[PDB]
Design a binder for this molecule. Structure first.
Ligand SMILES: *[C@@H]1O[C@H](CO)[C@@H](O)[C@H](O)[C@H]1NC(C)=O
Ligand SMILES: *[C@@H]1O[C@H](CO)[C@@H](O)[C@H](O)[C@H]1NC(C)=O
Ligand SMILES: *[C@@H]1O[C@H](CO)[C@@H](O)[C@H](O)[C@H]1NC(C)=O
Ligand SMILES: *[C@@H]1O[C@H](CO)[C@@H](O)[C@H](O)[C@H]1NC(C)=O
Ligand SMILES: *[C@@H]1O[C@H](CO)[C@@H](O)[C@H](O)[C@H]1NC(C)=O
Ligand SMILES: *[C@@H]1O[C@H](CO)[C@@H](O)[C@H](O)[C@H]1NC(C)=O
Ligand SMILES: *[C@@H]1O[C@H](CO)[C@@H](O)[C@H](O)[C@H]1NC(C)=O
Ligand SMILES: *[C@@H]1O[C@H](CO)[C@@H](O)[C@H](O)[C@H]1NC(C)=O
Ligand SMILES: *[C@@H]1O[C@H](CO)[C@@H](O)[C@H](O)[C@H]1NC(C)=O
Ligand SMILES: *[C@@H]1O[C@H](CO)[C@@H](O)[C@H](O)[C@H]1NC(C)=O
Ligand SMILES: *[C@@H]1O[C@H](CO)[C@@H](O)[C@H](O)[C@H]1NC(C)=O
Ligand SMILES: *[C@@H]1O[C@H](CO)[C@@H](O)[C@H](O)[C@H]1NC(C)=O
Ligand SMILES: *[C@@H]1O[C@H](CO)[C@@H](O)[C@H](O)[C@H]1NC(C)=O
Lengths: 227, 181, 304, 214
């Protein structure tokens, strides 16, 4: 079997090109064919193309034909996807995937179209927006009725994805909901992280949300207090 | 009477060109008429020679009337005269394979000796000249020896072997250790 | 058709335009009939920059089955036929006929063994453009055919006794050519492309590659009831028509069977500077013109 | 263009029971049909290829059937780890123009649970930055379907809010939802009462949570 490890996340302006890579380890490289599949946020899988590694021949989806190139470097066991003239709607996770074809070096070739092995994925964000860290605002608990109170942090106006949120430096996980981000009309992302805690615990227990945004090297800690 | 020099362990390409840009029948043989390699239509054949598993051509050039003999991982004993028969004509090329090695692969001390040994085929008599990073020049036949290494001799030496008016270049990395006195 | 009395005509099977014509015809036949999923051909006409031509097309599975071809006289020409039953194909023929067309020739594409062709009418015959040249192919024509049965399950069968009798007849002809006191040795192919290292052929539309070592491993003038050759069906092949590669789809039939008659061989002699009193012969082929020559050696086209 | 269509879009199944997923092709693809499983944040995983052959590491409770233009994925007894999104893939054509179905989301069917609704006014800090985000939280409900409306001074709002919803909770099988209303500070201070109204199967009547600015 083969392990597929892809290159890191990319951030691109519309009109740029991107080249993502995928290292295949663990088996005979030329006995596999490799395929690129992408998935826009909230959407399904989309087949982009597939290279017959032994022949150095790639075939592409019609809607991409002309602006996509798939190559393979047999000397480093590495597969490449290049996407040119990037559009905002090209924002997706890009997966490298592969399948064993038979003893290709001996002329045996199944030409399998299914996909057994998958890389971890590469986020490619295409946007006019520039990198920026989030503003973090408290969602303070109120008079949140019952024996349970709700509180949180609003994590607003950052780009690009992702942002990571924890509570009390990882000591608090029970009852936490960190919502998927939405894309605001400004082209910047926003999310909320909330948690439900005993209301009797307000005033005695301190709650701090830890927000990390690697792209802008920003780390914010926000104490969320009653009032 | 074309002479080509090869390096032991390297790859050499011997050329054979036809008078027209078309794939035709060719065959390479050695001086003892042993078949090395040729084509049968659009397929490659290999003969019962000692070069068999190290011999190849470049088929993407056949349609242009070029039928090279490519030999990888060269050995001294590959030294021979090779003949390409194409268009009822014969191209003769003499191959000489040389190897050059230092006495040790371990790090040397200042003041210690370095000896280089040229490995060569029967019937040849080459001249060797080698030069160290500092400019130290030494010349000889089969064996070249420097009596005492300087610290400044550490690095890549460049040795040129001269045979039949032709020359080939060897690069050999030598380590000479520094010390605190 | 009509025998020409007292007429002596020179033939040269190694320079025969009928061979070139048939070759182009078979290439065209294959292009139209057997389409690969991917086809690759080199193109290095440029300066230090190669441009592999790549064709991708629909590749339907088709049961390939050669049909006899008759060549009749091209406009302005006539076909002459050597009636000498043992003619070597190169020299004067004292018994010549004019014919309207050749016999029906099945254009079998194969290496090593010639299949479904014509048998010699008298004794086994061997032909070469220059026997002294170890690089020139030796065409063997049997006078008795030998059955070879192949299956997509991965092997070809040949009766061992019949094959053994065949080798003895061939070796005796090789002795008669190279020396009465020479030992005749058969050995496996010495190497090259898979298509010529193995006995390769097409059966049921599939490309077979059979290990022929067991057919060529004996010493002459110094087993089991059936010889079973391991075979392999390939999807990626080197093309015989010109330099390139083609890819075909995997088989769709679980019962691929064919039986052919071996009617000839293609051999090469090792040669070399040896004071040794023996000759070594290995299976060869690859140039399909030799296949067409094996049938057309007795014909020539002359302008009226 | 061979179009693959999956049904249903969402399948709700009680743990330990059978699930049947359907895949349809716009024309015949013979048996060149594969099924994949995908969990949030992960790569897809091959389950079935050739219409009915299980990939290595795939439990026997998964089985594929069909040929031509209609296919089925059956999971005979749903385990906790089987709840995911499932995709079919056609790979019959040549030259290759392989296509995927749009997916069937397989989720856990549990009893109805009404949301706990919380409202958060904007923070003083954000107000100082010149903008006002009001957040409505619907916590731990089932099923996923919920309606949230914003009213500002009894005026029904549209086009100025965004919703986000969590993945189904791995412990209690509920969902949570946020709705965020955003206005400029100037518009925010032009009104008094801010209310989010929640409609859900678990609630006999719409639930309203509100606050008076200031
Ligand atoms: C042909 O040969 C025969 C027999 O040798 C002879 O009688 C005759 O004169 C020759 N002339 C022809 C062509 O009839
Ligand atoms: C190869 O062929 C293409 C298409 O005809 C041509 O544009 C290009 O210049 C050629 N050279 C290479 C190696 O790309
Ligand atoms: C028939 O052809 C053979 C081989 O070329 C030749 O040796 C022989 O003399 C021919 N027979 C006659 C009757 O001339
Ligand atoms: C072929 O047969 C002819 C007689 O038809 C003869 O003249 C010629 O020498 C033969 N060639 C060889 C090499 O035996
Ligand atoms: C010439 O060959 C024919 C066969 O076509 C045969 O009948 C005849 O005996 C031969 N000619 C003679 C009389 O030598
Ligand atoms: C075939 O030719 C050989 C000589 O090469 C001979 O011994 C044998 O009898 C012939 N067989 C037939 C069927 O005439
Ligand atoms: C026949 O082959 C030998 C050996 O290669 C060669 O020396 C000779 O020139 C060839 N004869 C002809 C007529 O080409
Ligand atoms: C090959 O098959 C035929 C039947 O088509 C049979 O008569 C013959 O005995 C077989 N030969 C073998 C297995 O060598
Ligand atoms: C032919 O092969 C048989 C086995 O089938 C073997 O016994 C014998 O040695 C061979 N006959 C000879 C050498 O004439
Ligand atoms: C054929 O079989 C023999 C004996 O098993 C083996 O040595 C040889 O390498 C094989 N040849 C090919 C073409 O694989
Ligand atoms: C060659 O044949 C002999 C007997 O004829 C057999 O014992 C030996 O195994 C064979 N060798 C190969 C390479 O198949
Ligand atoms: C030889 O002819 C037989 C019977 O006519 C046929 O079945 C077989 O396919 C042919 N063999 C080849 C390789 O064409
Ligand atoms: C092969 O030849 C034999 C004997 O002439 C015949 O019985 C058989 O039908 C032939 N088989 C094929 C495949 O042509």
């Amino acid at each position: 079997e083969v392990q597929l490890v892809e290159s890191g996340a990319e951030v691109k302006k519309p009109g740029s090109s991107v080249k993502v890579s995928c290292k295949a380890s663990g088996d005979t490289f030329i006995r596999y064919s490799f395929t690129w599949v992408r998935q826009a946020p909230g959407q399904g899988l989309e087949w982009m193309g597939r290279i017959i590694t032994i022949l150095d021949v790639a075939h592409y989806a019609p809607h991409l034909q002309g602006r996509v190139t798939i190559t393979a470097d047999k000397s480093t066991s590495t597969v490449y996807l290049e996407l040119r003239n990037l559009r905002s709607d090209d924002t997706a996770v890009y997966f490298c995937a592969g399948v064993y074809e038979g003893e290709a070096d001996e002329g045996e070739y199944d030409n399998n179209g299914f996909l057994k092995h998958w890389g971890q994925g590469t986020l490619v964000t295409v946007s006019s927006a520039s990198t920026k860290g989030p503003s973090v605002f408290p969602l303070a608990p109120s008079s949140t009725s019952g024996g349970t109170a709700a509180l949180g942090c609003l994590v607003k106006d950052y780009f690009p994805e992702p942002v990571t949120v924890s509570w009390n430096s990882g000591a608090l996980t029970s009852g936490v909901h960190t919502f998927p981000a939405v894309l605001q009309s400004s082209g910047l992302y926003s999310l909320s992280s909330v948690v439900t805690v005993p209301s009797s615990s307000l005033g005695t227990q301190t709650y701090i949300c830890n927000v990390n945004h690697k792209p802008s090297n920003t780390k914010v800690d926000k104490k969320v207090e009653p009032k | 009477k074309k002479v080509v020099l090869g390096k032991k362990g390297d790859t050499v390409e011997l050329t054979c060109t036809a008078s027209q840009k078309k794939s035709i029948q060719f065959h390479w043989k050695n001086s003892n008429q042993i078949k090395i390699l040729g084509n049968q239509g659009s397929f490659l054949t290999k003969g019962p020679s000692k070069l068999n598993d190290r011999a190849d051509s470049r088929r993407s050039l056949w349609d242009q009337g070029n039928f090279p003999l490519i030999i990888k991982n060269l050995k001294i004993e590959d030294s021979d005269t090779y003949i390409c028969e194409v268009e009822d004509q014969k191209e003769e090329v003499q191959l000489l394979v040389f190897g050059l090695t230092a006495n040790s692969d371990t790090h040397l001390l200042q003041g210690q000796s370095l000896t280089l040994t040229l490995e060569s085929p029967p019937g040849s008599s080459p001249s060797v000249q080698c030069r160290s990073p500092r400019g130290k020049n030494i010349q000889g036949g089969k064996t070249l020896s420097v009596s005492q290494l300087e610290l400044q001799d550490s690095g890549t030496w460049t040795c040129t072997v001269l045979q039949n008016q032709k020359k080939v270049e060897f690069k050999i990395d030598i380590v000479v250790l520094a010390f605190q006195k | 058709e009509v025998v020409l009395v007292n007429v002596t005509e020179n033939f040269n099977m190694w320079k025969n335009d009928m061979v070139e014509q048939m070759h182009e015809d078979i290439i065209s036949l294959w292009d139209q009939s057997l389409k690969p999923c991917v086809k690759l051909t080199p193109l290095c006409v440029g300066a230090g920059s190669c441009n592999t031509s790549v064709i991708t097309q629909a590749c339907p599975k088709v049961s390939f089955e050669p049909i006899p071809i008759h060549y009749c006289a091209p406009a302005g020409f006539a076909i002459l036929k050597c009636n000498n039953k043992t003619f070597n194909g190169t020299g004067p023929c004292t018994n010549v006929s004019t014919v309207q067309c050749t016999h029906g020739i099945r254009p079998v594409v194969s290496t090593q063994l010639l299949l479904n062709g014509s048998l010699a009418e008298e004794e086994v015959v061997i032909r070469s453009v220059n026997f002294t040249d170890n690089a020139k192919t030796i065409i063997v024509q049997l006078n008795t055919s030998v059955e070879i049965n192949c299956t997509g399950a991965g092997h070809c069968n040949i009766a061992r006794a019949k094959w053994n009798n065949t080798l003895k007849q061939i070796a005796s002809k090789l002795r008669e050519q190279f020396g009465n006191n020479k030992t005749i040795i058969f050995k496996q192919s010495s190497g090259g492309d898979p298509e010529i290292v193995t006995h390769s052929f097409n059966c049921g539309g599939e490309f077979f590659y059979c290990n022929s070592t067991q057919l060529f491993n004996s010493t002459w003038f110094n087993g089991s009831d059936t010889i079973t050759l391991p075979c392999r069906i390939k999807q990626i092949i080197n093309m015989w028509q010109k330099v390139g590669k083609a890819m075909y789809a995997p088989p769709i039939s679980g019962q691929i069977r064919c039986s052919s008659n071996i009617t000839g061989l293609l051999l090469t002699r090792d040669g070399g500077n040896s004071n040794n009193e023996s000759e070594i012969f290995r299976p060869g082929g690859g140039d399909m013109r030799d296949n067409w020559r094996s049938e057309l050696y007795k014909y020539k086209v002359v302008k009226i | 263009d061979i179009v693959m269509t999956q049904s249903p879009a969402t399948l709700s199944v009680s743990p330990g029971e059978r699930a049947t997923l359907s895949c349809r092709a716009s024309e015949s693809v013979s048996s060149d049909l594969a099924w994949y499983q995908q969990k949030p944040g992960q790569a897809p995983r091959l389950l079935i290829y050739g219409a009915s052959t299980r990939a290595t590491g795939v439990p026997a409770r998964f089985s594929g059937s069909g040929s031509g233009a209609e296919f089925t994925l059956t999971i005979s007894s749903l385990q906790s780890e089987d709840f995911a999104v499932y995709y079919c893939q056609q790979y019959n054509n040549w030259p290759p123009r392989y296509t995927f179905g749009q997916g069937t989301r397989l989720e856990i069917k549990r009893t109805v649970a009404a949301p706990s609704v919380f409202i958060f006014p904007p923070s003083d800090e954000q107000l100082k930055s010149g903008t006002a985000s009001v957040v409505c939280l619907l916590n731990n409900f089932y099923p996923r379907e919920a309606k949230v409306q914003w009213k500002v001074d009894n005026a029904l709002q549209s086009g100025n809010s965004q919703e986000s919803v969590t993945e189904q909770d791995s412990k209690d099988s509920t969902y949570s939802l946020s709705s965020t209303l955003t206005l400029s500070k100037a518009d925010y201070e032009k009104h008094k009462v801010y209310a989010c109204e929640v409609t859900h199967q678990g609630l006999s009547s719409p639930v309203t949570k509100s606050f008076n600015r200031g």
